[PDB]
Structure 1
Amino acid sequence: ILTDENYVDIAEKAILKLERNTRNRKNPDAFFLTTSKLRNLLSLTSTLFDESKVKEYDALLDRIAYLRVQFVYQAGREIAVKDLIEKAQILEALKEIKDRETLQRFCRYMEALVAYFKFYG
């Protein structure tokens, strides 16, 4: 769960709580998770963060159902994204949308994950 006053500090903690490549000491403490696998997840939510402005919530609930498809599917492919949806409680937060203002809160929550990931290494 994530409120408006904490969802960035939640996402700041989740990147720190995510593991790093403790071996392979060539620019070490780098993540197993990569930037391009992370931007494939935000490419789902960023096209809903701007159709939340335009459209109703009553038309977006077909793709909001589809975000549980592909956040599961991207987690099944690579084990690094598998850890992201566990640490950042994404599959818990995605089942809790129910209106426009949480859809925009979750889609800003994914942007906070990308921001601190780019920040911390």
Structure 2
Amino acid sequence: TELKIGNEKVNSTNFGDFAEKAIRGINHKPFVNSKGGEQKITTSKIRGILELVNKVYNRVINTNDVELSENILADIAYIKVKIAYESGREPVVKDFIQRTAFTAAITDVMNQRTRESFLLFARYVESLIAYFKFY
């Protein structure tokens, strides 16, 4: 219930508000294009990010063990390499991964190795989808 991501703590009370203020920061200084101009992350990229999390979430949710499976931590590493691929593909997903501390959260999920930490990470990510679709 901690997720000390890079600088601070988001618990299971304000994960939505943290996603809200993160996205609120995004759509007030949107990423200036490398060719000059403005763009937003599109819905399909951010939806693929959510589906990429929720493939693992479906396997995690129905197992009561607070210890995450050793197979699951491998899939969390695969989340890391998939967002690395997409993030290296385009700059808009690069700083969307940078700004919302996605890699920091996923490393802290490796570090804690608890189900509830992953569940609150998935809580956070679906709140990112929620407040992105709200704007």
Short-chain TM bin: 0.7 to 0.9
Q: TM-score, normalised by structure 1?
A: 0.84
| Paired letter, 2:97 | I
Shift of residue 21 of structure 1? Answer: 7.2
Could you say which residue in structure 1 is the equivalent of 2:93? Answer: 81
Could you say which residue in structure 2 is the equivalent of 1:25? Answer: none
Whether 1:41 aligns to 2:49 is yes
Could you say which residue in structure 2 is the equivalent of 1:113? Answer: 128
Shift of residue 80 of structure 1? Answer: 0.9
Could you say which residue in structure 2 is the equivalent of 1:6? Answer: 14
Alignment match of 1:71 (pick from 65, 83, 89): 83
Could you say which residue in structure 2 is the equivalent of 1:27? Answer: none
* Structure 1 segments (4+ residues) deviating >2 Å: 19-22
* Runs of 5+ consecutive residues of structure 1 not aligned to the other structure: 23-29
Whether 1:101 aligns to 2:116 is yes
Q: Distance in 2 between matches of 1:8 and 1:21?
A: 22
| Paired letter, 1:62 | A
| Paired letter, 1:52 | V
Could you say which residue in structure 2 is the equivalent of 1:62? Answer: 74
| Paired letter, 1:72 | A
- Contact conserved, 2:16 with 2:124, CA < 8 A, in 1? yes
The count of corresponding residues between Structure 1 and Structure 2 is 114
Q: Distance in 1 between matches of 2:22 and 2:82?
A: 20
* Runs of 5+ consecutive residues of structure 2 not aligned to the other structure: 33-37
User: RMSD between aligned alpha carbons?
Assistant: 2.0
Could you say which residue in structure 2 is the equivalent of 1:20? Answer: 30
Percent sequence identity is 37
| Paired letter, 1:86 | Q
Deviates more, 1:47-56 or 1:5-14: 47-56
